[PDB]
Amino acid sequence: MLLFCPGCGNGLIVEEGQRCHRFSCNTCPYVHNITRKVTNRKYPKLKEVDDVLGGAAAWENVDSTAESCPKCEHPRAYFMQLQTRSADEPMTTFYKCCNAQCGHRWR
């Protein structure tokens, strides 16, 4: 990440001193000792998952005493939750029911 000197406002570089790593200016004496953990997270875009779960994938989220689906009122349906973008997104819930003479997709 860009961080800039309070004195002259040139761009800082990270270098190493005799006791700590420092943010340092190239044009003035200013240095800033890294005393504690500092971080910067990118969170890039993941792949699409839409065509990855279709067609009898290896899902696993089903559990004992799980709810029945609302149309058929039978537990013959899978349900899962996934991030669609990066993991800062709140996870979305989705479910699909597959029964005899009955095909549907629901949200």
Sign of CA dihedral 18, 24, 27, 29: negative
Which residues of this protein are in contact with another protein, per CB under 8 A? 1-2, 4, 6-11, 13-15, 17, 20-22, 24, 26-47, 49, 52-53, 55-58, 82-83, 86-87
> Nearer Cβ to another protein, position 34 or 71?
34
Residues 20-39 that bind Zn ion (CB under 5 A): 25, 28, 30
Provide the phi-psi class of 23: left if phi over 0, else alpha when psi is between -120 and 50, else beta.
beta
The verdict on whether residue 8 carries a ligand-binding annotation is yes
Q: Does 5 count as an annotated binding residue?
A: yes
- Strand pairing class (92-99; 102-106): antiparallel
Alpha-carbon gap, residue 45 to 24, rounded angstroms: 33
Token reading at 56: 């009898």
Smaller CB distance to Zn ion: residue 30 or 95?
30
Tokens at 98, concatenated:
């597959």
Q: Which residues are documented as binding site?
A: 5, 8, 25, 28, 69, 72, 98, 102
Q: Which residues are documented as binding site for Zn(2+)?
A: 5, 8, 25, 28, 69, 72, 98, 102
